[PDB]
Amino acid sequence: AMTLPAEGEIGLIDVGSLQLESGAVIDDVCIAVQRWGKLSPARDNVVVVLHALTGDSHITGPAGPGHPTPGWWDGVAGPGAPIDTTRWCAVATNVLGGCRGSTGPSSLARDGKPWGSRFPLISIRDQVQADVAALAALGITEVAAVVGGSMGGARALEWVVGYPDRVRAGLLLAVGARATADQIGTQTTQIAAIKADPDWQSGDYHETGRAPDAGLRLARRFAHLTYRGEIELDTRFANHNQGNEDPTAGGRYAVQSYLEHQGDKLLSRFDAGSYVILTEALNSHDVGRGRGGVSAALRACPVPVVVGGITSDRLYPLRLQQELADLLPGCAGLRVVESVYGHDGFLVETEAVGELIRQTLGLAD
Amino acid sequence: GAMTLPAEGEIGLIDVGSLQLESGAVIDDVCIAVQRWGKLSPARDNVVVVLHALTGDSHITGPAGPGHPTPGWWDGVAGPGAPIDTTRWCAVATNVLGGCRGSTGPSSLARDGKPWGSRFPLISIRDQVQADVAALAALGITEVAAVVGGSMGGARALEWVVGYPDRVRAGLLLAVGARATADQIGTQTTQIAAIKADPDWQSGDYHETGRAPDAGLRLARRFAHLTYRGEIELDTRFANHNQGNEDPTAGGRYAVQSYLEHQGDKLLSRFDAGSYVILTEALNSHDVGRGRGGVSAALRACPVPVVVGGITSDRLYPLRLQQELADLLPGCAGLRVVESVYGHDGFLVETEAVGELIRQTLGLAD
Ligand SMILES: [Cl-]
Ligand SMILES: [Cl-]
Ligand SMILES: [Cl-]
Ligand SMILES: [Mg+2]
Ligand SMILES: [Mg+2]
Ligand SMILES: [Mg+2]
Ligand SMILES: [Mg+2]
Ligand SMILES: [Mg+2]
Ligand SMILES: [Mg+2]
């Protein structure tokens, strides 16, 4: 019954208490939402856009006051765009556990203090439950489609599997049916780097004026390597030095300066507690849990879907998307995005990803 | 040089004296630890140098025990009828300059009686080869039959055959590239940053303080171990399963997580954080083309017969790097592909395939 925010603006949707997969109960949850395009009278034209690990609800448009980053899928929603806002209403949330409007470790609880270590562990399924509740509070009980890559693709997968009667189509991009050992390996070690930072303070650094900046930077540097293509990295930087710096005398290599810059950029806009909470959700991703395993769960989902994967992806290798396309009966076949940019192709390959979105919405109309 | 090799299997300490490094910096009183298997020939022309990788040592074969925290890292490679057949060859292995298993490195004591620590100069792969060559010369060995190595040992072997082509008859270059790649430098410099960000790093002078950067070294090793493994095999072995009866939701661990923590603990008990930094910086500086007109010119001008091998599932030194070496080194008859699910670690695990590469190499040396 709540009203959508004005186009482009952030709305804060109270969804109340949620029972979580761990057994924990979290009260007074708030989900930030942005939308583009008008809602149809039947409220049946919503396209939910699901952001990745460090993304937010700002899917398109420039950076500015209230938006540290530009649209992470800039141009995806608009007149004549892949999500054509003359027909569709693009809606994006800030995920549960995030730090740009939705309830997370850095958010203030009802006592005026950050949740901090009081914030419970959440799953991808918990994130979907919270988004579904936020849409329901807005009078939206069915969506035309859900689209997302990376962690967004995991949210989309659990949405189509968990609510097959309430979504007409999905795009699953650069994701797998469950977390893999390699993903869990790098992800748990990323968390360990943050927790080993002496300023982590058991997750309750928020009020102390100290923060685990060194740990968060290291986590992001290792993560960024998993997001890139091996060949393109060497084509861009090789073993060259940064500018006129001398690595044998305290200077940096070019790829090293680049990685340091990636760490600095994240620190300026993202919370370490959110990084930990959301990476834990990645670790527990498993569409098969409680549903008889991965094959049984996918084979029983009748939702039409487009599945896309990136050739050079080193974090979510193409074999994971081939499995999704082979097992989901609503998938006509894997769509292969050839890209040199690795996992990050799901953000950079604007033309190819735009076409996957258009194909997805074709299955929902 | 007229020192003698230690008794077989036993560690010998070779005084090579002061070395002038590629950078121009000088390091005094360098000691190189050595072990060997097999008798030396009267002409001293049957030496096969086995070059260990980042955290290896001179103990290439044999069990663990007193003085040896780890068993032979290429166990079985040297012996009667083995790939290095000690009825014919003398297998010699050093601990690399900058190491922590007998040779001079950051934890060694300098002339002033204090550990080198932050005073240890940055070294290159070429400096490592210079030291090994000097150690052999002190033993009266001026030419070697062959050099063999994988990973950082392959980088040492490559700089040996390119830098001393008249003093080596053949080389095995396994799971290595002509220069460090951007991806390698990326993970390597971040591993170093993790160690240096540890509060107990103490600018590299933690030695003898009672505190050491254990957390940073564990983290660096965990990330490195992932680069050493095969993606599919890791998931076949561990998948997303919990460790034993633990629950990650309630403080437990995932199976692959407990596995990685154990790799960290194992390295901690036998390896020094300062050595990890110095040797990783030598990997960052790896570039056979430097001062030689670039990679193509350097490789095309090296006439040494070589066997080049690469591992199908290697994610750290991808096969394209060994294709490049095999295409440019005129002494290479063609790339040898090692089929393995175990990633870069296949160069340690695929004993049969690697043993055949060594035999091929030694066939080029007689
Ligand atoms: Cl609770
Ligand atoms: Cl190693
Ligand atoms: Cl070149
Ligand atoms: Mg989960
Ligand atoms: Mg399962
Ligand atoms: Mg199918
Ligand atoms: Mg070097
Ligand atoms: Mg160069
Ligand atoms: Mg050739």
Side-chain angles (χ1 to χ4, degrees):
Chain A
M2 295 166 87
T3 61
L4 282 168
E7 279 183 75
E9 302 187 347
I10 289 168
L12 298 173
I13 312 301
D14 290 330
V15 306
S17 300
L18 303 176
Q19 290 276 348
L20 301 174
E21 258 196 301
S22 73
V25 182
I26 182 172
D27 304 309
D28 296 301
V29 177
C30 168
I31 297 301
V33 66
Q34 289 175 259
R35 62 101 171 208
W36 295 261
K38 190 197 301 184
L39 186 64
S40 70
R43 304 180 178 168
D44 63 357
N45 67 329
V46 172
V47 175
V48 185
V49 182
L50 300 165
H51 71 71
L53 178 67
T54 66
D56 61 11
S57 60
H58 198 49
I59 75 187
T60 191
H67 292 291
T69 44
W72 51 267
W73 261 358
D74 197 25
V76 69
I83 306 171
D84 187 351
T85 49
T86 65
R87 161 69 167 110
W88 307 102
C89 176
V91 180
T93 67
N94 186 214
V95 72
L96 177 70
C99 58
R100 292 305 309 181
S102 292
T103 301
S106 72
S107 300
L108 308 190
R110 289 285 288 184
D111 61 356
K113 301 305 204 181
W115 281 91
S117 67
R118 304 179 287 180
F119 193 85
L121 292 195
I122 58 168
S123 60
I124 301 295
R125 298 183 181 170
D126 296 330
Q127 300 171 348
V128 171
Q129 186 197 343
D131 288 340
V132 169
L135 288 171
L138 294 157
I140 299 164
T141 64
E142 298 176 345
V143 303
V146 297
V147 302
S150 195
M151 188 185 86
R155 296 162 72 186
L157 174 59
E158 282 290 6
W159 200 311
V160 301
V161 174
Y163 303 89
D165 295 318
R166 296 160 78 168
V167 59
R168 306 207 294 277
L171 172 59
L172 315 177
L173 175 57
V175 66
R178 60 151 173 89
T180 65
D182 185 49
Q183 295 164 4
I184 293 168
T186 187
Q187 282 158 190
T188 58
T189 308
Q190 286 172 40
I191 293 170
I194 294 163
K195 293 197 176 191
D197 186 311
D199 295 331
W200 168 247
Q201 298 174 83
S202 298
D204 289 312
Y205 61 83
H206 299 277
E207 313 190 59
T208 71
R210 298 172 303 284
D213 290 347
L216 181 53
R217 281 191 245 251
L218 292 166
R220 179 60 152 191
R221 288 174 60 166
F222 284 112
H224 187 74
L225 288 168
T226 74
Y227 301 154
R228 300 306 293 191
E230 187 274 322
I231 290 178
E232 196 270 334
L233 277 175
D234 197 66
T235 293
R236 183 171 178 187
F237 305 111
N239 65 336
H240 296 148
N241 307 324
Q242 177 64 19
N244 197 32
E245 304 187 13
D246 185 2
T248 62
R252 303 170 293 169
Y253 295 91
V255 65
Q256 179 185 10
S257 175
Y258 168 70
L259 288 176
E260 292 181 3
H261 180 241
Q262 302 306 311
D264 292 342
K265 287 195 291 168
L266 186 69
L267 252 60
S268 69
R269 67 175 183 79
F270 206 76
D271 175 72
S274 279
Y275 201 98
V276 171
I277 283 298
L278 299 173
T279 296
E280 287 289 10
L282 287 174
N283 285 337
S284 66
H285 175 50
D286 189 344
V287 73
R289 170 173 64 255
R291 300 167 179 155
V294 164
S295 297
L298 300 176
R299 278 164 169 165
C301 176
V303 178
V305 296
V306 176
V307 179
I310 301 158
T311 52
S312 55
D313 198 327
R314 298 198 292 170
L315 183 60
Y316 294 84
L318 195 66
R319 72 184 187 79
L320 299 176
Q321 298 91 49
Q322 186 66 71
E323 182 185 38
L324 287 173
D326 286 347
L327 293 175
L328 284 161
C331 182
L334 180 64
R335 314 300 292 192
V336 175
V337 180
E338 185 169 323
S339 178
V340 299
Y341 299 111
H343 187 62
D344 258 359
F346 92 90
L347 297 164
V348 167
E349 296 289 343
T350 55
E351 183 177 0
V353 174
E355 292 301 316
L356 294 179
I357 292 169
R358 294 192 158 100
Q359 294 172 233
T360 299
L361 302 186
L363 301 168
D365 62 8
Chain B
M3 301 184 214
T4 60
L5 286 166
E8 297 183 39
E10 302 298 334
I11 290 181
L13 303 170
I14 309 305
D15 178 15
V16 312
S18 309
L19 298 177
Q20 174 152 233
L21 306 172
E22 187 170 4
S23 69
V26 176
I27 175 161
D28 292 307
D29 311 323
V30 168
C31 166
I32 296 294
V34 72
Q35 291 173 254
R36 64 100 175 210
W37 298 262
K39 188 197 297 188
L40 188 65
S41 67
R44 295 190 281 196
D45 65 352
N46 71 329
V47 172
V48 175
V49 180
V50 184
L51 301 163
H52 68 69
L54 177 61
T55 67
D57 60 9
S58 57
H59 194 56
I60 73 184
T61 190
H68 290 291
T70 53
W73 53 266
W74 259 358
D75 193 41
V77 68
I84 307 177
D85 185 348
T86 50
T87 69
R88 169 61 165 94
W89 305 104
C90 179
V92 179
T94 66
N95 186 214
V96 68
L97 181 68
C100 59
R101 283 287 300 164
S103 289
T104 303
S107 65
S108 308
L109 302 180
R111 276 189 184 170
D112 64 357
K114 296 180 175 179
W116 271 100
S118 70
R119 297 95 56 80
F120 197 90
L122 291 182
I123 61 179
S124 66
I125 300 287
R126 302 189 188 172
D127 295 328
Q128 296 174 349
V129 173
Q130 185 197 337
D132 287 338
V133 170
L136 290 175
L139 297 159
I141 300 165
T142 60
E143 309 184 82
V144 301
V147 297
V148 300
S151 199
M152 187 183 85
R156 295 161 71 185
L158 174 60
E159 283 293 5
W160 201 310
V161 304
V162 171
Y164 304 82
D166 295 322
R167 298 166 73 169
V168 58
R169 309 207 290 277
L172 170 60
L173 312 180
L174 175 60
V176 69
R179 61 158 174 82
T181 66
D183 185 49
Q184 290 162 11
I185 294 166
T187 187
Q188 284 164 190
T189 58
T190 310
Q191 288 170 41
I192 289 165
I195 291 163
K196 292 187 179 179
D198 189 307
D200 292 330
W201 169 246
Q202 300 176 83
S203 303
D205 293 313
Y206 63 88
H207 309 281
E208 298 185 340
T209 70
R211 294 174 296 177
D214 289 351
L217 180 54
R218 278 193 256 253
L219 292 167
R221 178 61 158 190
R222 287 173 62 165
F223 282 117
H225 186 77
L226 288 174
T227 74
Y228 300 158
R229 300 308 290 198
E231 190 273 318
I232 293 170
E233 191 273 333
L234 274 179
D235 195 68
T236 296
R237 179 163 172 192
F238 303 110
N240 63 333
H241 302 151
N242 299 338
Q243 175 60 29
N245 193 28
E246 298 181 51
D247 185 62
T249 288
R253 299 176 293 165
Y254 293 92
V256 67
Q257 177 184 12
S258 302
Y259 168 70
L260 290 173
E261 287 175 6
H262 186 242
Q263 305 308 125
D265 295 332
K266 285 196 293 166
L267 184 70
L268 243 52
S269 66
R270 67 172 181 83
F271 205 76
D272 178 70
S275 277
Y276 199 99
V277 170
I278 285 294
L279 299 178
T280 295
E281 289 283 14
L283 286 175
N284 288 336
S285 74
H286 174 51
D287 187 345
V288 77
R290 172 174 69 254
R292 296 167 174 151
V295 165
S296 293
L299 298 175
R300 287 174 300 183
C302 174
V304 177
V306 294
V307 173
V308 178
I311 303 166
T312 50
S313 60
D314 194 333
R315 306 194 289 168
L316 185 58
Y317 294 86
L319 200 61
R320 68 181 193 84
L321 302 177
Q322 296 91 52
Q323 291 175 292
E324 178 179 38
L325 285 169
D327 288 352
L328 287 165
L329 283 163
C332 182
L335 171 63
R336 296 303 206 191
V337 176
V338 178
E339 182 173 354
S340 185
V341 301
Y342 297 107
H344 187 61
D345 261 2
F347 93 91
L348 296 165
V349 168
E350 299 292 350
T351 53
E352 186 181 9
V354 174
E356 290 298 316
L357 299 179
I358 291 170
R359 288 183 196 278
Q360 288 179 42
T361 305
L362 299 188
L364 301 172
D366 30 271

